[PDB]
Amino acid sequence: MAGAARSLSRFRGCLAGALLGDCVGSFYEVDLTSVLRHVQSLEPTEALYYTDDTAMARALVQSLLAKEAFDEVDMAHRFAQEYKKDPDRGYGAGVVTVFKKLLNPKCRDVFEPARAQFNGKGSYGNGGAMRVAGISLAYSSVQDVQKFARLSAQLTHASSLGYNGAILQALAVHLALQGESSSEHFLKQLLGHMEDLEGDAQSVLDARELGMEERPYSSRLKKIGELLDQASVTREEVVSELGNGIAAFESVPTAIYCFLRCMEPDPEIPSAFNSLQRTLIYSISLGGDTDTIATMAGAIAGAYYGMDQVPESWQQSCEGYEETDILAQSLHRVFQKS
Ligand SMILES: Nc1ncnc2c1ncn2[C@@H]1O[C@H](COP(=O)(O)OP(=O)(O)O)[C@@H](O)[C@H]1O
Numbered sequence: 001m002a003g004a005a006r007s008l009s010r011f012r013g014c015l016a017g018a019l020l021g022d023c024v025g026s027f028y029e030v031d032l033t034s035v036l037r038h039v040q041s042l043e044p045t046e047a048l049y050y051t052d053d054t055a056m057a058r059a060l061v062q063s064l065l066a067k068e069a070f071d072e073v074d075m076a077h078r079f080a081q082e083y084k085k086d087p088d089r090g091y092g093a094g095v096v097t098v099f100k101k102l103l104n105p106k107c108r109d110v111f112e113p114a115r116a117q118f119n120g121k122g123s124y125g126n127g128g129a130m131r132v133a134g135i136s137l138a139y140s141s142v143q144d145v146q147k148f149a150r151l152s153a154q155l156t157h158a159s160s161l162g163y164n165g166a167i168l169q170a171l172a173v174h175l176a177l178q179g180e181s182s183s184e185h186f187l188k189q190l191l192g193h194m195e196d197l198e199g200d201a202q203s204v205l206d207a208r209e210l211g212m213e214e215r216p217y218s219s220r221l222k223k224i225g226e227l228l229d230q231a232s233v234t235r236e237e238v239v240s241e242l243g244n245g246i247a248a249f250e251s252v253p254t255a256i257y258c259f260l261r262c263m264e265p266d267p268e269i270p271s272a273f274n275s276l277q278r279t280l281i282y283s284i285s286l287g288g289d290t291d292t293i294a295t296m297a298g299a300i301a302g303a304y305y306g307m308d309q310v311p312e313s314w315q316q317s318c319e320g321y322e323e324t325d326i327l328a329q330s331l332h333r334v335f336q337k338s
Pocket residue numbers: 091092093094095096118121122123124125126127128156159246247
């Protein structure tokens with residue numbers, strides 16, 4: 001079991017969970033039967049490549065470790081150089097333009113490329129959120145998590161839909177690292193934070209311009225509360241109400257739903273699977289952007305259940321699982337230990 005709030009086990013389980021989500025989810029980038037069939041093939045060697053989700057998470061974490069702090073110039077450069085070195089990881093069509101501009105040594109304003117995206121409105125993709133878990137490992141306070149989730153996200157994702165998705169994901173990880181909670185209290189804390197954020201005029205403006213409801217993440221969290229109280233919620237219901245898409249708004253709430261729903265056993269998923277495995281399986285069964293939804297659900301679940309629920313056979317199937325683990329331990333030593 002995962003032990004105290006912000007334990008080493010929780011740190012390790014968080015990054016391993018994210019890696020598992022990316023690697024296993026990537027196979028389907030779908031039905032529950034087919035997923036269950038496919039995961040049997042993990043049972044008894046870095047055979048599953050990671051994608052942009054992990055590549056960016058690793059750069060983000062390496063920046064934090066390098067500076068023992070957030071440094072936007074260092075982080076932007078690490079993202080750009082990681083892309084330069086290994087461009088075929090499955091980066092979004094939009095965000096590669098950001099990396100190209102950052103690679104220009106004349107670029108001394110590292111937030112400006114992201115702001116120019118999509119006719120100056122910014123990306124609303126889930127790429128800011130997919131990599132953000134490291135932020136919550138580095139920072140314990142809600143205040144710092146919000147601040148640095150936003151800043152890290154804004155390096156590529158300047159739309160409030162994009163960066164607020166990243167904050168929500170980081171807040172979910174923040175909470176999961178604290179250990180045992182009712183699903184009620186977990187969801188309620190998230191709702192409260194997003195209601196606070198969606199009172200800001202930039203959030204209200206971005207939402208209105210995109211033709212959405214007035215406080216979008218808040219509305220989705222309320223929907224999650226309803227779904228968690230509803231009988232026999234089907235994949236159709238989840239996907240139609242929450243989404244399974246590349247947009248942050250259609251993937252971050254979904255990931256959180258998968259975590260909360262899978263806190264309890266489910267007779268549709270064999271009992272031999274543990275809670276972390278169940279969460280990953282369920283999230284992939286939703287289809288769509290299985291890679292990023294599973295990566296995000298995995299980060300939350302990993303933080304909550306800890307490393308003892310990370311199956312060696314799954315973990316050792318993933319490219320770079322040892323590097324991922326070292327980074328988690330390093331985050332714990334530098335920012336959690338003294
Ligand atoms: N403001 C936007 N207008 C139109 N499409 C967008 C917008 N923001 C994101 N997208 C879509 O989402 C995709 C992924 O976003 P992008 O920022 O490239 O990468 P990431 O997957 O890292 O979020 C884009 O290639 C595009 O298809």
